[PDB]
Ligand binder design. Sequence first.
Ligand SMILES: CCCCCCCCCCCCCCCCCC(=O)OC[C@H](COP(=O)([O-])OCC(O)COP(=O)([O-])OC[C@@H](COC(=O)CCCCCCCCCCCCCCCCC)OC(=O)CCCCCCCCCCCCCCCCC)OC(=O)CCCCCCCCCCCCCCCCC
Ligand SMILES: CCCCCCCCCCCCCCCCCC(=O)OC[C@H](COP(=O)([O-])OCC[N+](C)(C)C)OC(=O)CCCCCCCCCCCCCCCCC
Ligand SMILES: CCCCCCCCCCCCCCCCCC(=O)OC[C@H](COP(=O)([O-])OCC[N+](C)(C)C)OC(=O)CCCCCCCCCCCCCCCCC
Ligand SMILES: CCCCCCCCCCCCCCCCCC(=O)OC[C@H](COP(=O)(O)OCCN)OC(=O)CCCCCCCCCCCCCCCCC
Ligand SMILES: *C(=O)CCCCCCCCCCCCC
Lengths: 122, 177, 87, 155, 49, 63, 65, 128, 540, 62, 79, 171
Amino acid sequence: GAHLARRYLGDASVEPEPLRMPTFPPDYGFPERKEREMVATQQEMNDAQLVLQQRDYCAHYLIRFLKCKRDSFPNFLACKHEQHDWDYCEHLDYVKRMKEFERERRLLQRKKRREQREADMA
Amino acid sequence: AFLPSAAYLTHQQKVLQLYKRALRHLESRCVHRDKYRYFACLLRARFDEHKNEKDMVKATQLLREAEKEFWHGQHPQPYIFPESPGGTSYERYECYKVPEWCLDDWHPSEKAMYPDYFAKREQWKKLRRESWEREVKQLQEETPVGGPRTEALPPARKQGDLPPLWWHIVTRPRERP
Amino acid sequence: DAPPLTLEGIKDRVLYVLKLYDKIDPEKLSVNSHFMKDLGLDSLDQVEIIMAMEDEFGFEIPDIDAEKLMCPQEIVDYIADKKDVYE
Amino acid sequence: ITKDMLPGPYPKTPEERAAAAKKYNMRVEDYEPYPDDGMGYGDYPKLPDRSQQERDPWYDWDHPDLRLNWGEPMHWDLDMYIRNRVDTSPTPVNWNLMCKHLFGFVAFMLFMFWVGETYPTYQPVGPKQYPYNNLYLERGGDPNKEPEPVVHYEI
Amino acid sequence: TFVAYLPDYRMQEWARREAERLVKYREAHGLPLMESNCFDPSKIQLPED
Amino acid sequence: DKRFLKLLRFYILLTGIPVVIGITLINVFIGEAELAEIPEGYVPEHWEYFKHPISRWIARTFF
Amino acid sequence: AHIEPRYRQFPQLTRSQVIQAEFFSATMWFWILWRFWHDSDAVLGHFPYPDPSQWTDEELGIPPD
Amino acid sequence: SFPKYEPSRLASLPTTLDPAEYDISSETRKAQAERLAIRSRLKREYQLQYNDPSRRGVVEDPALIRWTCARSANVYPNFRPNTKTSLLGALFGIGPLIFWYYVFKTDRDRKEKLIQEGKLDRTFNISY
Amino acid sequence: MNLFSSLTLVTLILLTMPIAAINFNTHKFTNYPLYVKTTISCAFITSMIPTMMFIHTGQEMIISNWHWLTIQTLKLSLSFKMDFFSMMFVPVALFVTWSIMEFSMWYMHSDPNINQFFKYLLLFLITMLILVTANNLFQLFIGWEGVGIMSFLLIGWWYGRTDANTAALQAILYNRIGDIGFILAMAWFLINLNTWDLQQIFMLNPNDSNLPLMGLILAATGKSAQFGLHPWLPSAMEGPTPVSALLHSSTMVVAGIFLLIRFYPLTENNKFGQSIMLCLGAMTTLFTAMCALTQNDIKKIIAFSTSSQLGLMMVTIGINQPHLAFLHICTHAFFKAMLFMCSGSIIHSLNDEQDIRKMGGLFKAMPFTTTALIIGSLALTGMPFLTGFYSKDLIIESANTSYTNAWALLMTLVATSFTAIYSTRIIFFALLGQPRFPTLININENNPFLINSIKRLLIGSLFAGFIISNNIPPMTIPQMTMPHYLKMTALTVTILGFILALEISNTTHYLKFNYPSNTFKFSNLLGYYPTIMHRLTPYM
Amino acid sequence: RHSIFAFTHVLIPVWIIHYYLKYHVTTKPYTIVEKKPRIFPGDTILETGEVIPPMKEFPDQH
Amino acid sequence: SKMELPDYKQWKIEGTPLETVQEKLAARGLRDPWGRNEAWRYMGGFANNVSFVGALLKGFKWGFAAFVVAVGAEYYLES
Amino acid sequence: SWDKDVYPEPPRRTPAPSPQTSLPNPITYLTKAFDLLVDRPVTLVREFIERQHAKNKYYYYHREFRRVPDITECHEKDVLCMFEAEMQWKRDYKVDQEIVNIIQERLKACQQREGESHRQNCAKELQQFTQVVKAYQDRYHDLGAHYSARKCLAKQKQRMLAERKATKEAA
Ligand SMILES: CCCCCCCCCCCCCCCCCC(=O)OC[C@H](COP(=O)([O-])OCC(O)COP(=O)([O-])OC[C@@H](COC(=O)CCCCCCCCCCCCCCCCC)OC(=O)CCCCCCCCCCCCCCCCC)OC(=O)CCCCCCCCCCCCCCCCC
Ligand SMILES: CCCCCCCCCCCCCCCCCC(=O)OC[C@H](COP(=O)([O-])OCC[N+](C)(C)C)OC(=O)CCCCCCCCCCCCCCCCC
Ligand SMILES: CCCCCCCCCCCCCCCCCC(=O)OC[C@H](COP(=O)([O-])OCC[N+](C)(C)C)OC(=O)CCCCCCCCCCCCCCCCC
Ligand SMILES: CCCCCCCCCCCCCCCCCC(=O)OC[C@H](COP(=O)(O)OCCN)OC(=O)CCCCCCCCCCCCCCCCC
Ligand SMILES: *C(=O)CCCCCCCCCCCCC
């Protein structure tokens, strides 16, 4: 919650604004960066009738958890392994989003150092 | 101000009503009973400091600033007893307080469900319709000229008279019908 | 719920409260112990007695009837008048 | 019932005022009518405009719910000042000061919600990234056309 | 009982059954389900300009 | 009030129960019709265009 | 026998109402500590929140200039 | 010292703060006794009809009947045109008519100018 | 299909049968309240089978069984929607209603109009199940006005009392001012989407839905007692305690919230409507939870409690987390009906005592009522792993860890503190300390109706939050990564509310009398809003 | 005649309502429309017997 | 029908907070008249009532005991 | 029975029951109980009713209105021809209302039947719905409560003059 006091009381240019970001290119600084892999097929998660907010890159863990909960009824306490797999992969996706935000912030720090070097050198 | 028998409140009556309201709003402010009891004797000393005040100017002025002390030092929501006006049960059972004259319009088969009650009720109606002219002639001989002064009704005097205007005072419905 | 009251019960409870009062002795106290002429009480003590009756039986006596109950038996009769006991 | 116990035109002489105050069954010095402005009151008295909630509840009234008597000259807005309606009872805090408190609190809270919308809070994360061109067919894109490549990489 | 068994009051049941017949006819024949013109534009003369 | 409600229930049910039983017996024994295509040459009656028998009787008798 | 009305004193208690109140209080604390032992994570936290300052420039792709 | 209570129309002044309650003068005694007299007369005359068993009907209240006649019958002969009645009848008789008239006329002219320019979203409006 | 739709309609027709039984009577009954109670019992047991076969298969359907009317483009059929919302809320409401009516067989035993009371209360249950199963806005307007009119007839139950009639006319005034916006919404949907059915509204997916969502926010403001249209819920406690207990805690007052939850595919595409819902919910949950703290009538306090929880529901719809809001409905039903039943058993055992300043000494004297009231208050605060945890803790965690108005989030947390404050205020001034009630003790709670009726909601308030939050299938992605100071925000604010209100409770025993400030005078007169707007606006 | 409450309030209404829903409601189009059952990879269809092929092997995180 | 009253002599205020009030009124020269009318609220079975932190922990004892027994049974149950 | 060609319903695909857990579900036992206690006696009563139907079989018919000349070929102020034109137009207007209702039934049934993937898997029903609403708005909207074939013809002619002007000003 300190970043609100860094963007509201400090400056806003070195803080990446969430509504339009990433503004740096993703290949800028990553030599040979690989694409993200979707495990669950589009026809599979169309058959699985997942919610449009639920159709992120890791829908396959949720498909396995819903298949478990359908297949373990009337036991509603037999699917904690699948739920923990899905929640940990959502944790990893949240950490990847944090890394995207911190990537944008440290690259704005890089551009700040670039413009300060230009203002102090030429 | 506005009372049936008396036309006003005396100074002493104002002081007693202020003492009663001050203790009730104190009990509102001072919820627990030992704390209320401690501040109640403190307030008792506060009112009994000026018990013997013979100057009626000074007594009425102490009443006036005591009213202002009460008006600044009251609670917005006092404890109202529920069957008292402002309570959570005042005039609740008036939906069951059916008056007595509706028994006269019953079908005679369901008067024949309570035979002894209506046989006992007709002698009440008999006693009322014989006592009515006796209490009218009791009122018209005792009341002074120009209308009565007080709303205090007189009682019965003879051995055979019932007190005047006694029907809706006796035959009022109960508080739990 | 709402237990039915009698004149005997009202009498015994009012006298039981008045025997828990410190400016009234429990040996001179009778069913007609008049509070001003006999028991040596203030009118302020009368107001406290009627307020103890209200806190006792759980209904507010108005001031035009509070200022006139001068004996315990008038209090028994007024609570019987407002509660309809021995129905 | 007949004409002279039903209201008439505006009283202008004092003896007509006395007869009218005898009609409404009140004192002549207590009798004050509405002013003859043409708004349609006639000889009807301008009562002191108090609500019926203010009256003594413990009295043996004639009309118990209305707190009113027989023969008492009723208020013009007696239907309006019933206890199921408008009350004129005194409150602890003044009317001006209560209006100031309520309007100041309302304007303060609405201003603070406006400033909080102006300065929104968030969490230090990126956007929630979705495959298949940010779910193009699932959000309702047409299959015959083809969107731009919305591709997200590994971090 | 009389209002309950009115013989197709204002032909609404007929209209639904006829709409079923027409949509069944013009879904098989590749026709549009409803023209934007209520009448044939070949049998309407426009005012000249 | 109870006398009015008892007579209300009686004078409604007095023809309600026979009409309900008659409609029930029509639906069981006579019954709903079946939609047939119009034969060539056959011009039906106006009451023959309706599915329920009571509707057919209303169209045939009164309407 | 029903509860006799009493005067200025503590009312009569049935055995059954007191043992039911104690049984449901103990059942509440059994449920609270039971889920506190089996879950322990819906209250405290599930997954360790990383520190964004401790991330290296290699894994975030920050070329030095 | 203390906050003086300010009386309002919708929240009046209490009796126990009003300065006319502590008047013990003789004309106040005469007024309270005459109001007691008229009130006791009305109470007694009411309960002479209210308790009579030969009466089986409505104790007519000439106060209540007088009020209902004043609310409905005695309006017209005392209605006189002046500054006050004519101005308040102009503002509260045809005023809000003019307000809602120009509101709805402006709204419908704006919507009609939008529709005959084809600017208004009317894609599924077919129930009118 | 064959079993699901069958038991679906059997529950509704079964609930309509005792209305026929009371309308076709000749005799005086052999306990017609037992008849209505057994009907509701078997209706719950019937309706749990569609719940189970929705938890297993995820099966939903529409019963558009009876064609009613066709206005040229609008085939109005009797259309029922058996979705997750209906499947979860119908057995919850039947269970809570069955508890309230076995409460009412005891508490309303002194009534000769007991059959009329149970008739009205079953009519309310039928109109609410019309409201929660409606697949079109005309039938939802039927259920809406049905709960409004039965709110009138049950607030004005003891009808000779002027206060009940005034509170009922007030309740109708605020509900119809909400109906202005509801009719605005229905008018927008007919003129723009040519339907009242929910399916075509969700399929067409309108974008410029600012006006119908402002209409729905006005409707929820009228029904769920939000700010501006709240004061009928304080006044509405002048009806019977089972009326407030059933309707204005768990069943009626959630219907505006339930209306907004029904249209979440319209709220999820409008930031303006969600900002209005978030601002209005935070304003309501500050104001009502503040005004709860300084009251003495226990039903006023529990009414402001349930209005603060409805403002929390409006918040957690405004953060676009609708299934947690519906879980908060299905959570809040159990313990708030149980807290009203405990307060009503305190009312009955102390011979119509609703005031907390004449209570005390009921810890040992009423042990089961004190036990269940502490359990209901802890479930209201958000005690770990009660029923209130699985909704309200996740609501606080998803409100902190999302894009939110900052000031609205802070008001939500101040409300979270005030909940613990009035919860331990009820526990202290009602159960703890020493007695303050008058000297004739008629403390009794030994009826199997009362004991079983509080017992079933007690089993619910313990286990049902766990059972529901692990039986329902998920619908969004739960945010389950947040730091220690942000995961533990809710419990820290809750414990601070506990400790600060305990210090307030310890200041009630010190022998010093302080003159009341403007804060207590503001909050005790309900924020002055029933003082101004009830004296000025009818005068205008 | 001990539990005739259930017989006259469920079992006869289940008869009436199932006769209604079976021979007058399902006989009409789109009256009872059902959300189609949720299909997962690896399932067996009861209608065709066509088995849905399973998911790709996971990039295991743990 | 005839209800038996308790004794008016057994309700003495000594040992109660009414006696503390009597001390704090004698500290500035007063006297309390209504002590025994209120002294039943601080005696009998209603005296020595619990505070809030213990009224929360009602059932904590046997709840934690059955919790320990159930933890032992489930840990000996997995083996 | 209705026609599936005017009310399209796709082939349903239900999953095979896979009990992984050792507890049985209540739903199979309740389905057996339903299928024995309720589904069989109702079918018996229906077979008795069907036999009483088949002992007296009779038929009703869909009424066929042969096409009379419409308002474009009726003389001005000649009521014997434009009466039949107006009755033809009113029957066609009522049938078009029910066509729009049928396509709405298709749309709502598709939205429910596809569930959460409704926005993807009902583009054809939504497209047909938009087309039939466009045609019905072009054909019958804004005619007023005194709608007739004259009002419909005048609206069509104003639409055709607008179309002709917009086409001619594009050349
Ligand atoms: C009982 C007496 C009650 C009181 C009577 C008096 C009533 C008052 C006076 C009324 C006077 C008349 C008024 C005018 C109305 C006239 C009738 C009319 O217009 O009918 C219209 C309409 C059309 O009838 P139709 O045109 O003649 O027939 C249609 C077809 O053409 C043809 O259809 P079909 O031929 O297929 O139908 C034939 C039908 C005969 O037709 C009728 O019955 C219809 C005529 C009666 C109509 C009555 C309507 C009156 C109101 C009734 C409801 C209220 C009653 C009181 C309250 C009760 C509690 C709720 O046959 C049967 O009923 C036989 C089947 C019996 C099923 C039950 C048992 C099955 C299992 C048995 C197992 C045991 C044996 C096993 C072994 C066997 C071996 C062989 O009929 C109805 O609507 C009937 C009512 C029931 C409808 C469904 C009810 C359930 C719906 C549930 C969902 C919707 C509600 C949701 C509510 C949500 C919460 C609020
Ligand atoms: C008529 C215009 C002038 C106005 C004034 C008229 C005054 C003179 C009066 C003349 C007689 C009356 C004329 C109007 C009659 C209209 C009635 C009628 O025929 O209806 C036909 C409708 C017909 O329904 P339908 O429209 O579906 O038609 C079906 C078509 N047939 C029958 C051919 C297959 O009748 C019914 O719906 C009756 C069905 C049975 C009853 C309903 C079942 C449920 C009953 C209520 C249960 C409880 C519900 C929840 C409530 C709980 C408590 C709040
Ligand atoms: C409980 C005892 C009942 C009486 C005992 C004897 C009868 C028992 C029944 C046995 C089965 C009989 C055969 C099945 C029933 C008849 C079947 C049939 O085809 O019926 C014809 C039809 C079926 O619908 P339909 O589509 O064929 O007919 C509609 C009518 N037209 C086409 C003319 C427009 O009617 C009924 O079945 C009526 C059922 C009504 C149920 C609901 C009542 C609602 C009451 C409130 C009214 C207001 C609603 C407002 C909201 C509207 C929506 C927004
Ligand atoms: C999303 C948007 C949200 C917007 C929120 C803010 C906007 C809405 C603001 C509130 C508007 C309604 C509130 C004002 C009227 C309140 C009426 C009421 O409740 O009156 C109660 C009063 C007596 O009750 P009370 O005194 O409280 O009882 C305790 C004991 N005396 O009872 C009476 O005195 C009886 C009165 C009966 C007659 C009333 C006559 C006046 C009617 C006024 C209609 C106003 C219409 C406004 C339309 C707006 C359209 C947009
Ligand atoms: C910085 O802390 C970012 C988080 C969002 C803004 C501050 C939110 C403050 C309220 C939550 C914690 C409250 C603890 C009492």
